[PDB]
Amino acid sequence: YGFQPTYGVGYQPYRVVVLSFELLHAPATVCGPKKSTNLVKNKCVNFNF
Amino acid sequence: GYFKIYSKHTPINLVRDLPQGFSALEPLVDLPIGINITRFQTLLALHRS
């Protein structure tokens, strides 16, 4: 490749990253964080500890 | 798909055979890895000198 700053749009270098997800029957280990809230007491509430 | 290791340590005074007593074993570690384990060995700390 002959990438140069003088090159126009479509000719300049572009960094590309492709993410793919694999689901082998092994236990899943990678994904986003679980949100959390505050703790309340002495009130009938529903919870997901 | 989970490798569980449980462990326990005890003070002993008898020499030859296993002591006659009861003591539960606590969980030590869990590993989320999938292998079809069928055989194993043991390692020794030989004094290479």
Ligand SMILES: *[C@@H]1O[C@H](CO)[C@@H](O)[C@H](O)[C@H]1NC(C)=O
């Ligand atoms: C264990 O054996 C099953 C049955 O053939 C196979 O699907 C799996 O890939 C094997 N796992 C390993 C780690 O060899």
